[PDB]
Amino acid sequence: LTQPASVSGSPGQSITISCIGTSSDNVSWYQHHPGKAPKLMIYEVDNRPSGVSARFSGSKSGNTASLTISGLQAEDEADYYCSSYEVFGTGTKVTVLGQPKAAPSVTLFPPSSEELQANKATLVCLISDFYPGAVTVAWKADSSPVKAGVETTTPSKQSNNKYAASSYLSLTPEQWKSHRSYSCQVTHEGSTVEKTVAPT
């Protein structure tokens, strides 16, 4: 089956998902939020399971089935697969655009006492629960920006449709105790959040 790679819209855009190459009758749709098993959305062509929203409605045009969502709610974003008999579609990356922005949460850990007992010192700066997935991480040692030995992962989806990312700073034990504080600054949609730790 042939499906669009991704569709884009906003709350109220009401994008319709195409399903090309399907035979007559017996067409089903599935909504798959990452981290949980997919749920049935359309029984056959236009039918709906009990307990599902009437906002999801299906239709058929003889050779191509389609799914219409009356309003793109902030909850309803996932990969959608239409299945004819025992084969599904390519998978539609249905993304939203009008969603409220969520400020990130930053937690910073100084290098552990055990790690320092092995000539290793790493700072772990964990970022979570931010939308959309685009954050800039900058490390500062007593105000001086530091770039050597910084590894920040690309943001990834969580189980609650928000994003998470982790930033690490590899340091020697000598330069950890020399400075008075190390700071993890993360900027998200123009608003920056900052956490600092010290050798204590």
């Binding site: 949980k36 098993a37 990969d79 299945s83 008999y85 025992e86 599904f88 390519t90």
Partner: protein, 210 residues
């Protein structure tokens, strides 16, 4: 309420076997088929097959026949999916969903199990790329980086382009190197590509001919 509880997440070496449980509650386990559907590492869903719990008969997809063993234990109302000799492509999410009849309203999909097949140190499978013309060699299914490619023991260095490797879905690496030579020397001089993969201590030579 109808529930389908699956086993825990499992990590297996290549070549090992994995059996995934799917215990059904809240409905008559005999009256509905049990399908098994993958998710692939970042790709779309992929149907594996379905099993009749009432009769024991099974039906598999063409690309999984001879590899997947679907069986059920009706005493405790559970369905099992067994994958034999896991390859690097087999790392995916596995779901069990119930169905009935010729139609496919897969109502409940359980929870899912993450089967991860870690990448192993594997040497490349060098193949020839037969053909101003261009011939080369295919450096497939090696892990990890890097691989060194030379032609004619380093005697040939003109018009050689070794393209960067591609990271496939399996997590392995595939690379290609080609050499451009005049079209008049195909039947005169041979061509040998030497591929080195030190991590697996693999050194292989292949002859490329039209």
């Amino acid at each position: 309420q109808v529930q389908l509880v699956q086993s825990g997440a499992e990590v297996k070496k290549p070549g090992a076997s994995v059996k995934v449980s799917c215990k059904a509650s809240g409905y008559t386990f005999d009256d509905y088929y049990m399908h098994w559907v993958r998710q692939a590492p970042g790709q779309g869903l992929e149907w594996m097959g379905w099993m009749n719990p009432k009769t024991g008969g099974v039906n598999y997809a063409q690309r999984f026949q001879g590899r997947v063993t679907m069986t059920r234990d009706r005493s405790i109302d559970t369905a099992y999916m067994e994958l034999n000799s896991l390859r690097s492509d087999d790392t995916a999410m596995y779901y069990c969903a119930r169905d009935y009849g010729g139609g496919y309203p897969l109502d409940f999909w359980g929870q899912g199990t993450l089967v991860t097949v870690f990448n192993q140190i594997k040497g490349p499978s060098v193949f020839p790329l037969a053909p101003t013309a261009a011939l080369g060699c295919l450096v497939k299914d090696y892990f990890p980086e890097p691989v060194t490619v030379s032609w004619n023991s380093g005697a040939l260095t003109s018009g050689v382009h070794t393209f960067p490797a591609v990271l496939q879905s399996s997590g392995l690496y595939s690379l290609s190197s080609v050499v451009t030579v005049p079209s008049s020397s195909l039947g005169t001089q041979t061509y040998i590509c030497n591929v080195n993969h030190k991590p697996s201590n693999t050194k292989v030579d292949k002859k490329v001919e039209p």
